[PDB]
Amino acid sequence: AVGPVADLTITDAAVSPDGFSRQAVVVNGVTPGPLVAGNIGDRFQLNVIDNLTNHTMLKSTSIHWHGFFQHGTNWADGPAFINQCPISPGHSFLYDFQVPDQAGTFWYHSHLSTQYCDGLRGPFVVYDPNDPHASRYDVDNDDTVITLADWYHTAAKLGPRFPLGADATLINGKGRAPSDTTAELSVIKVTKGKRYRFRLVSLSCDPNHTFSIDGHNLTIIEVDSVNSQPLEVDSIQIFAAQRYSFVLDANQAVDNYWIRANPNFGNVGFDGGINSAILRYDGAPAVEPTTNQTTSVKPLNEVDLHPLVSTPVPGSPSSGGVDKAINMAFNFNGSNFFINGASFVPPTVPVLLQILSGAQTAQDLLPSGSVYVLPSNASIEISFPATAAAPGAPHPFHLHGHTFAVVRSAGSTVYNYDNPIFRDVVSTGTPAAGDNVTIRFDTNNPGPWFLHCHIDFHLEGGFAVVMAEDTPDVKAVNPVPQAWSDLCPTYDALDPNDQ
Length: 499
Ligand SMILES: *[C@@H]1O[C@H](CO)[C@@H](O[C@@H]2O[C@H](CO)[C@@H](O[C@@H]3O[C@H](CO[C@H]4O[C@H](CO)[C@@H](O)[C@H](O)[C@@H]4O)[C@@H](O)[C@H](O[C@H]4O[C@H](CO)[C@@H](O)[C@H](O)[C@@H]4O)[C@@H]3O)[C@H](O)[C@H]2NC(C)=O)[C@H](O)[C@H]1NC(C)=O
Ligand SMILES: *[C@@H]1O[C@H](CO)[C@@H](O[C@@H]2O[C@H](CO)[C@@H](O[C@@H]3O[C@H](CO)[C@@H](O)[C@H](O)[C@@H]3O)[C@H](O)[C@H]2NC(C)=O)[C@H](O)[C@H]1NC(C)=O
Ligand SMILES: *[C@@H]1O[C@H](CO)[C@@H](O)[C@H](O)[C@H]1NC(C)=O
Ligand SMILES: *[C@@H]1O[C@H](CO)[C@@H](O)[C@H](O)[C@H]1NC(C)=O
Ligand SMILES: *[C@@H]1O[C@H](CO)[C@@H](O)[C@H](O)[C@H]1NC(C)=O
Ligand SMILES: [Cu+2]
Ligand SMILES: [Cu+2]
Ligand SMILES: [Cu+2]
Ligand SMILES: [Cu+2]
Ligand code: NA
Ligand code: NA
Fold this sequence. Notes:
Number of strands: 31
Number of domains: 3
Binding site for Cu(2+) 4: 395, 453, 458
Strand order of the largest sheet: 10-9-12-17-14-15
Oligomer: monomer
Binding site for Cu(2+) 3: 111, 400, 452
Radius of gyration: 22 Å
Keywords: Copper, Disulfide bond, Glycoprotein, Lignin degradation, Metal-binding, Oxidoreductase, Repeat, Secreted, Signal
CATH architecture of the largest domain: Sandwich
Family: Belongs to the multicopper oxidase family.
Binding site for Cu(2+) 2: 66, 109, 454
Number of helices: 5
Largest sheet: 6 strands, mixed
Strand content: 35-45%
Structural class: mainly beta
Distance between the termini: 30 Å
CATH topology of the largest domain: Immunoglobulin-like
Bound molecules: a molecule of 5 linked components (NAG-NAG-BMA-MAN-MAN), a molecule of 3 linked components (NAG-NAG-BMA), 2-acetamido-2-deoxy-beta-D-glucopyranose, copper (II) ion, sodium ion
């Protein structure tokens, strides 16, 4: 683990996480990037050093720290042309922010075009020395982080616009494609008799994964970065960019057990050990498990998750009982996605820079028809009705700058204004279920914040809008460092081929 103060050097390098060799974007020499860690209250100073040379995978870059509120530091959030211009090749940029009021499991990733798909992504943990769940496990360290990622043999800019799934699922950086089922698999070690806090992080660009471990049940204690009541399950469907902490009690016989992460599409199932890793008890021989999957009889359902501490839902407990209700109507024309009639196209001047330069109203802010001006210190309700007009469902939506209440989940026709889970990425479900996923949050974080489908190819296709929150205070609340004001002139001075 590096951090809370660290250099992250970005380069292009050859890698072969499933035995097939390809060029990729790597962080400190590896993909996924190394674990970044600290404790609640730390100040993070992550110096991002751009040494990229390969334009096909972009030579510029920009990093988002997924799940952090960034109160007072909206400039450090990451999304290109929303919160900054990209870092240019051969330059560095110091992201300097504090985490006074959050702890949990997070991650970081490029937030420039579809660059994270090519490798720029890794996990990020903020420990709490008074964690209220600390008494449920014995081990929680670098070796208890489990990442999942889709891997493609053809680069993001060189394959289809909307890929039909990945060549391999990788678990802690390794996995098999059907074309080579002898490639080395990841091993996660446990000691019989000890209890583990496993921190499961989806680094996926697209597929969701159905996650299970042969012979073991899992106790969910954290949802994205929110502590939950303990929920016992035997499988977990996890969508792109989501996180869960689960406790596993290593109390079965000393042996090798299959860890499984089945994608919703691409190469599904497990023939030859695809979509698998190995849980190995100390003592067991270094071989593959021969265990069998049994039918999940206790799968995670989101409506069953509730926060550990009572947290009132924003607003009054009835439909539209808030200061501002926004409905997101989806459309798609074969190459581009739309939200209320507008497909997102990044502006020339970053949204934050427009605001600092005086723009405060929906009328003044660009791009027109994609920026929503929200009142300050108010309750907001957003609904995302599922429709056949938007193929590639279920779309997992992410709100920057905020954790939100899920008042209505996918696969449920009920509204819960009493005790639903809060999180930061939510499946919007499917038209076959008649879904109308609905969320609420309060606006106490002045800044423009991205709201978008976390399937990166959908994002590249324009499936996004901007929440411009409390625009009269943005300038006063987020002072910016000189190195930030210098990003756009350096970036805009570049030759196109050096982007
Ligand atoms: C997914 O979920 C969303 C979010 O709820 C639904 O959209 C809301 O849907 C209902 C349509 O039934 C809308 O409700 C109606 O609102 C009228 C007033 O709307 C205006 O003002 C409100 C409040 O300022 C604004 O939100 C809105 O933009 C309008 O400008 C009321 O007049 C209606 O009351 C009349 O009809 C009702 C219902 O039958 C009667 O009970 C009343 O007595 C009255 O005569 C009604 O409440 C609401 O405006 C929508 N919200 C939006 C767009 O934010 C989606 O429809 C749902 N989609 C799917 C596929 O399920
Ligand atoms: C910069 O990064 C890109 C993207 O990873 C690298 O592209 C790689 O480009 C090569 C050369 O064209 C591709 O190989 C070719 O594939 C085609 C199509 O199947 C085949 O017909 C050719 O005969 C050849 O094998 C390669 O697949 C591609 N890699 C990926 C992941 O898409 C490029 O090499 C990098 N540039 C440098 C200088 O390293
Ligand atoms: C896990 O849960 C199932 C279903 O509740 C239960 O019957 C089973 O014995 C548990 N498995 C283990 C290994 O405890
Ligand atoms: C889809 O919409 C976009 C954005 O309006 C437009 O530029 C593109 O040409 C359209 N594509 C098709 C296939 O119509
Ligand atoms: C608004 O701000 C007040 C004052 O600090 C706070 O107590 C309250 O929870 C907030 N209400 C909303 C709707 O954000
Ligand atoms: Cu993210
Ligand atoms: Cu985010
Ligand atoms: Cu999507
Ligand atoms: Cu984002
Ligand atoms: Na937390
Ligand atoms: Na068997």
